[PDB]
């Protein structure tokens, strides 16, 4: 329950047309669609009030909207183009322009040439004995590199169970070619456990990376493999060494 917004990520070619679902639960009358870019607060793109409404904020360019069902505010775009490449947020409240609840958020990248879209390339690095014998603690480090856009989600799995204590993924993707505005990104995460735990070699350490690239009905003409929404991962079994 709450307020559910789909999808989470999406990669678009200019002149395409997807739609953003905003699901609402609280039986609320008012619903809004925002747009968050580096350097400013939110900027209203559109809103509704019951089942027929639109207008405010700053709707150019191609943002048509729709409020058929009281529960679902559909933000759409029939000619996706840069800009638009921002981070969208649906929201709702029963007030008017009062207390309102936001959806997880959609991070959309609109390009013109899908040619430079890349799946990540995870890899796991095992603790340094130098460390083990000094801290009585071992840190594994995961590294996903060379992916565009930055639509990923890194998670650790220990023994088929995802952990959250002792972890720390970077808040922010790192550019490989800081110059080139459309640079491949890279992310790192550290999972640290006791020197006893790593030692035991029946403990399984799996680094997982979810990537949201191409779709199935997306033209692709490159020599390489279609960079579709996929999972990349790297394993590592504990060592007495």
């Amino acid at each position: 329950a709450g307020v559910t917004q789909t999808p989470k990520f999406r990669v678009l070619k200019t002149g395409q047309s997807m739609t953003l679902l905003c699901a609402q639960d609280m039986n609320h009358e008012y619903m809004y669609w925002y747009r968050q870019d580096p350097g400013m607060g939110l900027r209203l793109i559109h809103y509704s009030v019951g089942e027929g409404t639109t207008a405010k904020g700053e709707v150019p360019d191609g943002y048509n909207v729709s409020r058929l069902k009281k529960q679902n505010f559909l933000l759409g775009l029939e000619s996706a183009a840069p800009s638009q490449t921002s981070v969208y947020f649906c929201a709702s409240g029963q007030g008017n322009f009062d207390i309102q609840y936001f959806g997880a958020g959609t991070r959309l990248s609109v390009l013109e040439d899908l040619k430079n879209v890349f799946p990540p390339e995870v890899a796991v690095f095992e603790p340094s004995e130098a460390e083990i014998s000094h801290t009585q603690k071992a840190t594994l480090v995961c590294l996903a590199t060379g992916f565009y856009p930055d639509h990923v989600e890194l998670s650790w799995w220990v023994n088929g169970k995802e952990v959250h204590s002792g972890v720390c993924t970077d808040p922010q993707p790192l550019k490989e070619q800081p110059a080139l505005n459309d640079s491949r990104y890279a992310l790192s995460s550290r999972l640290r456990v006791s020197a006893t735990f790593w030692q035991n070699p029946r403990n399984h350490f799996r680094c997982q990376v979810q990537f949201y690239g191409l779709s199935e009905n997306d033209e692709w003409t490159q020599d390489r493999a279609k960079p579709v929404t996929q999972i990349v991962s790297a394993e590592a079994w504990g060592r007495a060494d």
Binding site: H134, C168, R192
Partner: protein, 197 residues
Amino acid sequence: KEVEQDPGPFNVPEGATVAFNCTYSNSASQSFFWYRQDSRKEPKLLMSVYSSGNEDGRFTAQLNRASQYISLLIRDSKLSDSATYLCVVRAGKLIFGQGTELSVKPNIQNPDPAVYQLRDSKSSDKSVCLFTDFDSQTNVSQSKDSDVYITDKCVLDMRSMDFKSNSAVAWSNKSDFACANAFNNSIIPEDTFFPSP
């Protein structure tokens, strides 16, 4: 213009307390709110500010329709409070602040910096260097070279053991670089440990 908010980031020791301020030009503004937004997720309501002044709880917020500002006072900070705090004002059509960021840093009990090297599975090795356990005061900046990559410090937490540590990483396409020279563009402790064998 319209809604101005505290500028630069507020980096603060964990036990501390913080102060936030928001200015609103439009005199006849009606409603006011504070919103906490973790990185990089969505806005979540925190307070609603009234002229009565608030209370709940460890949090305080107040409205001076007089000077046309509202404030947020977070006392007894927690690492969790790390996020961007946003002033929202109902001015007939509701303006959103650009936001002011708060990074709460953990004060390291037993600080022993170190620069280990973790070897890769499979083969080729490549290699990555790990900067860990330095104090919170220490800063990790990027590198002179365009082919070497560094990540800013990242606080890690081990609940079970009641132990938090910092941590940054550096790697590169064999230059060949090493750990000895890794973070030379950064100000590292005058006792930082560098293994080798």
